[PDB]
């Protein structure tokens, strides 16, 4: 049985009423559970049998069912509630989970501050070159970085990483690392990362010449 959750992400504020939904691909009766999980921590049971509140869980959480559609409602969002939420059917084996809905803290748009870092000459003595692009303190999370090597779009040779929402200001930061052989690094001149973000009127480019 496939469990589909919606939306995949939800931005909200303390005091908001929020609802997140879970649809089963076929009848699961009311054998539906909802779980909360915070980063690096084990899940916690919130709702079982579609609408029964787990002992000790605050009653601002409630579940409901309409056919194959299940809804988790938080009636007044509190700071502890920002987390990922999973549904799970246990009507029949194999038990299956929804793909998760992450509930994040809404704030105002903030454009990223972009920085580019060439490889260190220390690393170049090792045979590999790492070029790093930093997108600092931006919101919302969706951003895109494209690496440009002598105007040629790079693909398959970068990796990126994003922080969790900042505890103080609720922004994100992102780092993208372009990895090249030092041979390929030597053979080109211009290295640029191009950043697109809702907070930017047009894409921002940071570049350097080797």
């Amino acid at each position: 049985i496939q469990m589909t959750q919606s939306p995949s992400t939800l931005s909200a504020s303390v005091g908001d009423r929020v609802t997140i939904t879970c649809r089963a691909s076929q009848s699961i009766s009311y054998w539906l559970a909802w779980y909360q999980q915070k980063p690096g921590k084990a899940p916690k049971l919130l709702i079982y049998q579609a609408s029964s509140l787990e002992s000790g869980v605050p009653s601002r959480f409630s579940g409901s069912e309409s056919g194959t559609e299940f809804t988790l409602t938080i009636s007044s969002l509190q700071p502890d509630d920002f987390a990922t939420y999973y549904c799970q059917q246990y009507n029949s084996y194999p038990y299956t989970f929804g793909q998760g809905t992450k509930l994040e803290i809404k704030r105002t748009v903030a454009a990223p501050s972009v920085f580019i870092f060439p490889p260190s000459d220390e690393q170049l003595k090792s045979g590999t070159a790492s070029v790093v692009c930093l997108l600092n303190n931006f919101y919302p999370r969706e951003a895109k970085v494209q690496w440009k090597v002598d105007n040629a779009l790079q693909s398959g040779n970068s990796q990126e990483s994003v922080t969790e929402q900042d505890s103080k200001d609720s922004t994100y930061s992102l780092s993208s690392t372009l990895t090249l052989s030092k041979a390929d690094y030597e053979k080109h001149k211009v290295y640029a990362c191009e950043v697109t973000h809702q907070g930017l009127s047009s894409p921002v480019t940071k570049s350097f010449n080797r």
């Binding site: 899940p43 999973y86 246990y90 084996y93 060439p118 090792s126 790093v132």
Partner: protein, 216 residues
């Protein structure tokens, strides 16, 4: 307190056997189902199978039948999951969890309900790599950014501090990424007044590596 205590994190090579454990406390272990759930890095929850410790009745997801063995030792309230031949794709957090019951006192539990008690997870990392300390490279710079690239180490984690913990505002230490080499890499950055133009303190417990790199 009702609890499940799982065994510590494991770093293994592919092909190796591994058995992890889940010990119950504060409740009748033989009266409740135990489930095992996998969470691959950055992904959701996946159910692997379940066991009733009172009689070792077991069920496996088709996706895990024949890759793992789930067992229990009721005499010491412990459930186990065992791999005969770990694969790289077995790198994940593994949870054990107890299924809810209204009244544990009835002898026949019926099917496994929602998971009301969860263990703290056991991280299993499977890789052909060997323990290796990081190379640390500087990320050279009103606001300036500077940082440290902490590259080619295994296994996770490294910890990074700035100016021995005195510099914490404006610091961002990113999650490690797994490189195609099989080694990890992360960066840590800080923004500072360009007028003040800094040492990053990198520790990698597995390799007993400590590096304090000036970023000039």
């Amino acid at each position: 307190q009702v609890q499940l205590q799982q065994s510590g994190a494991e770093v293994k090579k592919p092909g190796e056997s591994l058995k992890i454990s889940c010990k119950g406390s504060g409740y009748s272990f033989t009266s409740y189902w135990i489930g095992w759930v996998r969470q691959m890095p950055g992904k959701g929850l996946e159910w692997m199978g379940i066991i009733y410790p009172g009689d070792s009745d077991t069920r496996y997801s088709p996706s895990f039948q024949g890759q793992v063995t789930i067992s229990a030792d009721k005499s010491i309230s412990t459930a186990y999951m065992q791999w005969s031949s770990l694969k790289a794709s077995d790198t994940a957090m593994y949870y054990c969890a107890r299924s809810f019951r209204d009244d544990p006192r009835i002898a026949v539990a019926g099917p496994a309900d929602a998971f009301d008690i969860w263990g703290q997870g056991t991280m299993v990392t499977v890789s052909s790599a060997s323990t290796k300390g990081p190379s640390v490279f500087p990320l050279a710079p009103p606001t300036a950014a500077l940082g440290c690239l902490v590259k080619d180490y295994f296994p996770e984690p490294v910890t990074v501090s700035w100016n021995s913990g005195a510099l914490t505002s404006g610091v961002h230490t990113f999650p490690a990424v797994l490189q195609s080499s099989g080694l990890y890499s992360l960066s840590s950055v800080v923004t500072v007044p360009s007028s003040s133009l800094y040492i990053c303190n990198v520790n990698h417990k597995p390799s007993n590596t400590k590096v304090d790199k000036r970023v000039e």
